[PDB]
Amino acid sequence: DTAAAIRAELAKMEPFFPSGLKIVYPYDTTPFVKISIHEVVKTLVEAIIL
Amino acid sequence: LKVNQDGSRVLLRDVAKIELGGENYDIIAEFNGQPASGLGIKLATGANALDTAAAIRAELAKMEPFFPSGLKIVYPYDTTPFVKISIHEVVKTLVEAIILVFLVMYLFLQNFRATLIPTIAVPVVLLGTFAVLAAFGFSINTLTMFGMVL
Amino acid sequence: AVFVPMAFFGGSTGAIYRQSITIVSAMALSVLVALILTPALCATMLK
Amino acid sequence: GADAKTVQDTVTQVIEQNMNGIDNLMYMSSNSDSTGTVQITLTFESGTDADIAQVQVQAKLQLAMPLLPQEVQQQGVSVEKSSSSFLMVVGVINTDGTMTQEDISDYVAANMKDAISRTSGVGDVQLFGSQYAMRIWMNPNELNKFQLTP
Amino acid sequence: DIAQVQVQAKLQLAMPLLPQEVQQQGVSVEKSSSSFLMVVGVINTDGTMTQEDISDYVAANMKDAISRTSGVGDVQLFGSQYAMRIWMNPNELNKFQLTPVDVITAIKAQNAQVAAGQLGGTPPVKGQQLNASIIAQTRLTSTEEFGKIL
Amino acid sequence: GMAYLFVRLPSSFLPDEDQGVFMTMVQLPAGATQERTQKVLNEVTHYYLTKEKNNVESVFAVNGFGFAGRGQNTGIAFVSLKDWADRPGEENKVEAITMRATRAFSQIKDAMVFAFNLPAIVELGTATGFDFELIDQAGLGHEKLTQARNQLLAEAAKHPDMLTSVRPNGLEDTPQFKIDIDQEKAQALGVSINDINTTLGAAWGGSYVNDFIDRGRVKKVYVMSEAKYRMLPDDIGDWYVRAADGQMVPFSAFSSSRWEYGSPRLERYNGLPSMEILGQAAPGKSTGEAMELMEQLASKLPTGVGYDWTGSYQERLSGNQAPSLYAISLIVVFLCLAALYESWSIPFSVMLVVPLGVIGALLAATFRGLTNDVYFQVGLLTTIGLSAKNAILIVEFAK
Amino acid sequence: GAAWGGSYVNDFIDRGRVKKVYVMSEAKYRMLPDDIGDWYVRAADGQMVP
Numbered sequence: 001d002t003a004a005a006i007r008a009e010l011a012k013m014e015p016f017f018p019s020g021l022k023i024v025y026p027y028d029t030t031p032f033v034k035i036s037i038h039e040v041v042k043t044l045v046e047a048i049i050l
Numbered sequence: 051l052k053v054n055q056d057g058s059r060v061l062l063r064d065v066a067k068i069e070l071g072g073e074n075y076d077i078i079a080e081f082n083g084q085p086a087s088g089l090g091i092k093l094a095t096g097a098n099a100l101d102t103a104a105a106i107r108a109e110l111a112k113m114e115p116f117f118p119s120g121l122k123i124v125y126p127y128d129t130t131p132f133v134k135i136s137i138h139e140v141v142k143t144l145v146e147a148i149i150l151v152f153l154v155m156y157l158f159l160q161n162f163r164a165t166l167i168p169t170i171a172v173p174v175v176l177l178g179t180f181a182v183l184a185a186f187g188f189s190i191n192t193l194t195m196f197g198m199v200l
Numbered sequence: 201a202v203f204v205p206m207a208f209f210g211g212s213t214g215a216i217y218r219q220s221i222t223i224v225s226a227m228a229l230s231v232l233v234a235l236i237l238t239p240a241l242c243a244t245m246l247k
Numbered sequence: 248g249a250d251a252k253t254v255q256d257t258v259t260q261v262i263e264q265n266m267n268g269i270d271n272l273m274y275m276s277s278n279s280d281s282t283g284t285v286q287i288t289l290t291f292e293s294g295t296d297a298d299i300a301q302v303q304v305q306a307k308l309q310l311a312m313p314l315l316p317q318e319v320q321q322q323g324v325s326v327e328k329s330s331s332s333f334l335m336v337v338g339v340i341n342t343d344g345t346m347t348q349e350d351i352s353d354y355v356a357a358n359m360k361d362a363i364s365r366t367s368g369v370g371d372v373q374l375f376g377s378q379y380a381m382r383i384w385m386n387p388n389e390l391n392k393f394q395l396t397p
Numbered sequence: 398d399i400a401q402v403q404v405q406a407k408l409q410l411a412m413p414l415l416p417q418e419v420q421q422q423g424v425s426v427e428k429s430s431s432s433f434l435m436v437v438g439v440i441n442t443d444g445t446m447t448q449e450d451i452s453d454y455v456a457a458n459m460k461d462a463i464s465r466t467s468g469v470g471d472v473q474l475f476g477s478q479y480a481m482r483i484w485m486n487p488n489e490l491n492k493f494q495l496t497p498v499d500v501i502t503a504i505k506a507q508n509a510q511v512a513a514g515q516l517g518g519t520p521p522v523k524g525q526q527l528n529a530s531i532i533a534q535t536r537l538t539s540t541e542e543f544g545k546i547l
Numbered sequence: 548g549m550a551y552l553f554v555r556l557p558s559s560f561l562p563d564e565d566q567g568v569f570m571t572m573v574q575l576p577a578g579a580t581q582e583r584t585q586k587v588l589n590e591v592t593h594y595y596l597t598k599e600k601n602n603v604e605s606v607f608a609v610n611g612f613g614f615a616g617r618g619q620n621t622g623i624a625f626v627s628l629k630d631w632a633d634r635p636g637e638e639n640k641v642e643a644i645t646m647r648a649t650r651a652f653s654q655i656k657d658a659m660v661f662a663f664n665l666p667a668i669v670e671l672g673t674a675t676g677f678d679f680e681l682i683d684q685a686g687l688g689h690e691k692l693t694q695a696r697n698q699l700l701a702e703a704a705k706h707p708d709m710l711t712s713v714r715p716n717g718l719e720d721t722p723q724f725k726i727d728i729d730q731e732k733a734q735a736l737g738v739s740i741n742d743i744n745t746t747l748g749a750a751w752g753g754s755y756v757n758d759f760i761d762r763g764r765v766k767k768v769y770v771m772s773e774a775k776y777r778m779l780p781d782d783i784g785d786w787y788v789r790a791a792d793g794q795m796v797p798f799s800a801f802s803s804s805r806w807e808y809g810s811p812r813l814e815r816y817n818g819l820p821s822m823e824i825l826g827q828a829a830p831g832k833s834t835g836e837a838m839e840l841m842e843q844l845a846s847k848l849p850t851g852v853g854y855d856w857t858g859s860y861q862e863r864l865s866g867n868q869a870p871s872l873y874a875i876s877l878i879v880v881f882l883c884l885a886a887l888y889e890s891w892s893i894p895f896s897v898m899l900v901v902p903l904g905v906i907g908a909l910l911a912a913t914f915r916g917l918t919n920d921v922y923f924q925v926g927l928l929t930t931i932g933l934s935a936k937n938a939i940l941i942v943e944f945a946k
Numbered sequence: 947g948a949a950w951g952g953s954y955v956n957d958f959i960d961r962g963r964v965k966k967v968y969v970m971s972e973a974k975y976r977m978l979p980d981d982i983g984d985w986y987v988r989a990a991d992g993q994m995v996p
């Protein structure tokens with residue numbers, strides 16, 4: 001949730017950038033939790049069905 | 051400051067006027083065109099309001115007796131008496147919401163004793179609701195008191 | 201829950217639709233009062 | 248003494264580049280005056296504990312206190328709990344032994360004001376006038392007369 | 398939220414027992430989490446710029462807003478914010494008989510903001526028509542103006 | 548009809564009340580003095596004493612201090628009205644009292660005086676109103692920001708539509724007397740720049756020197772100057788600094804006098820230069836539309852000029868709240884009419900007594916000059932409750 | 947101390963924002979041990995001293 005609002009500040013910053021200034025995303029933990037819900041709620045569903 | 055050649059002394063008074071006066075001359079107040087100072091007290095972002103202002107008079111009451119001649123306190127802009135009206139007009143309204151009860155209960159049932167049960171029913175509920183607001187956190191607000199009437 | 205859902209407040213209007221609950225406490229006591237007590241009095245003494 | 252541009256970067260901006268690492272924060276506003284006065288407001292969320300937000304803020308400004316002019320240091324820096332409004336406003340005047348818009352303002356701030364501000368959780372007091380001070384009005388013609396400066 | 402205060406108001410009884418160099422530098426008491434999470438790199442593509450032009454813009458637009466956002470512990474800027482950098486030549490110092498002590502003195506004199514008072518304030522003469530703030534020494538802006546220091 | 552009488556019924560938050568206490572502010576033009584604004588606070592006190600003895604018990608004027616901020620350009624009187632018993636009519640109550648007060652201060656005055664009602668509440672929640680703020684995000688200054696906000700105030704006031712009322716908070720924009728101390732001229736004749744800066748700063752602005760003790764209590768000691776030697780621009784040269792060589796040197800030797808335009812109140816939002824904008828939604832439109840038809844005006848401005856909403860609202864009460872509330876309040880209700888009943892008919896009976904009572908609750912509020920505020924938005928829910936009751940009696944006893 | 951290690955002197959303003967001012971030395975006059983003697987302090991008697 002903290003890292004969601006890291007992009008909140010960052011999103012209002014982009015439009016007033018000089019020419020060439022572009023943001024890039026190395027080392028990020030956000031998408032790991034997106035996998036742990038999309039793989040568990042998937043597992044969940046397969047534990048029904050089965 | 052100095053001792054010039056010929057033994058003469060330059061003092062601080064000899065170069066500058068010296069009076070015991072305020073450290074800020076930016077603002078000065080008039081109470082009805084009469085010279086006045088005061089205390090514009092402001093709340094503390096969570097304080098209990100009318101209890102806080104009750105103890106504003108606690109300090110102030112022990113101050114009065116040791117005043118110079120003429121020094122008298124005066125009360126402009128005050129929120130205290132507004133809450134005294136909102137209890138004395140609500141507990142009045144409350145009472146008129148009974149009374150007006152009783153009437154309708156006699157009109158429909160000439161049996162007295164019957165007009166009595168509804169007139170105990172509701173006082174008891176009003177009371178018990180005070181006990182649950184105290185238990186959950188809230189106070190006797192302008193809002194909660196209007197919700198005793200609705 | 202005409203009351204408590206509406207008393208799920210959001211923002212500066214926190215205590216505003218909140219302080220229901222003041223209402224619900226009053227309702228559930230008028231239920232209690234009328235589930236206990238009124239049953240009693242009605243029998244106790246009437247005609 | 249400072250003007251609007253002077254306070255804006257020597258105090259205002261210095262504290263603003265040192266107003267971070269503070270739990271819960273919607274926004275931060277600011278003022279900078281020609282009178283020589285600055286006032287920031289860090290507004291927090293609804294129902295945020297104001298007894299602790301008035302510390303994370305007030306121990307953070309302070310890492311930028313040594314980066315300010317010494318004039319501001321010996322003046323009153325403050326971090327209090329606000330309520331944009333007054334409630335009790337206790338006027339104070341004289342009747343019989345008449346006194347001025349300065350004699351009254353000093354007695355108010357040298358007997359009653361200090362006790363009022365610490366009483367039942369007061370946020371902040373605004374004295375309507377000024378406490379007395381050893382005021383010295385330097386004459387520049389009587390300064391040149393004995394070869395001297397302020 | 399409270400252990401970050403008992404600690405940070407205790408270090409501070411030993412702040413005056415430190416060198417003045419450390420005081421004007423950044424002392425800090427923050428909440429740690431031995432690790433990063435979001436690491437937002439920042440580069441240029443078309444209008445190419447350097448490992449210094451980018452690090453300043455990051456720490457003069459986005460960094461201050463990031464550190465106060467949704468409860469961030471501490472930010473580590475990968476580079477450095479810009480500063481008026483001066484590289485003293487010791488051969489061109491001996492040429493005019495000078496030391497780095499004199500260089501420093503001229504910066505704390507010409508690069509400065511002074512608080513001049515105001516016309517028409519503060520306790521005026523009854524009948525003054527105008528009241529404006531006095532400006533005096535203004536802080537330096539560019540690399541050219543630092544080159545013209547005497 | 549229930550729809551028609553509801554969409555038209557306008558939205559407020561919470562009614563403005565007679566609190567036995569209101570107040571009224573003062574403000575003067577660029578570079579006015581303590582004498583000027585005290586003349587205005589004097590004339591204002593007469594409307595409340597000479598022309599309002601029946602309603603006003605007292606007044607507490609304060610010169611050089613508005614609720615905008617501070618300075619000898621402002622003022623503020625705190626009214627304390629006589630009790631409610633001695634004030635009978637609507638005439639003699641805050642709405643009417645501050646109405647002909649405002650009319651009198653726009654007529655027989657020549658500055659800027661108002662008089663406002665006392666919300667209670669806090670400052671916010673005006674409703675059909677907003678608080679914009681224009682930010683400088685790029686590396687421009689105060690001079691290019693003033694020009695940008697002027698353009699946004701102009702586009703707002705040149706196609707409104709359906710109209711508006713919009714003006715800055717208080718950057719009045721007044722001159723400032725700059726002094727240019729030449730540094731090669733100073734050192735030449737032998738004066739320290741330290742000595743010069745505490746001569747101009749201590750004399751004109753004052754200086755907190757040291758503490759003393761008056762009557763036991765410790766107070767401050769200030770050093771400044773007699774008033775007459777620091778009123779005008781020509782009094783600068785009367786001050787003589789001492790030079791190394793034991794001879795006096797006037798200020799005019801090194802200094803240079805000239806005027807310059809600045810701002811007496813530089814404001815900033817989220818660690819960036821900024822200016823507050825206080826507008827209000829139209830008499831027709833209301834808020835959700837006004838804010839979004841100010842957003843497309845802000846994006847039509849020069850580069851390095853964004854925006855952000857100080858400070859109005861976060862989420863309101865007719866808006867995303869009320870719906871969601873009633874919405875859920877139905878998904879229940881239908882339940883517990885099932886937990887004691889079983890069918891698919893019992894609850895749909897109770898679930899259209901809802902609009903029965905509602906229509907009259909509107910009607911009345913729509914007829915007499917009230918509005919959809921908080922108090923009406925809770926008698927609304929006390930009705931579904933009393934309707935359910937009355938109805939459910941019909942249902943339970945018959946089933 | 948100011949030459950080899952630098953010294954935080956005073957604050958200035960670049961593009962509105964207030965930043966720092968540092969004083970140090972060109973890189974080449976502070977790399978090795980023999981560059982110590984190239985710095986000349988001033989003595990009371992107005993003459994240089996290595």
Ligand SMILES: CC[n+]1c(-c2ccccc2)c2cc(N)ccc2c2ccc(N)cc21
Pocket residue numbers: 214293294
């Ligand atoms: C937002 C604070 N907060 C919480 C709360 C919410 C989330 C976590 C912890 C406490 C709260 C939680 C429960 N159950 C019941 C009442 C309140 C409440 C009531 C009034 C208020 N003015 C703030 C309130």
Ligand SMILES: CC[n+]1c(-c2ccccc2)c2cc(N)ccc2c2ccc(N)cc21
Pocket residue numbers: 572661663712713714
């Ligand atoms: C009419 C808008 N409006 C209000 C206002 C009036 C009633 C309710 C809310 C705001 C206003 C209120 C106070 N106190 C001080 C100054 C102004 C103001 C100043 C200039 C302007 N061009 C419109 C202004």
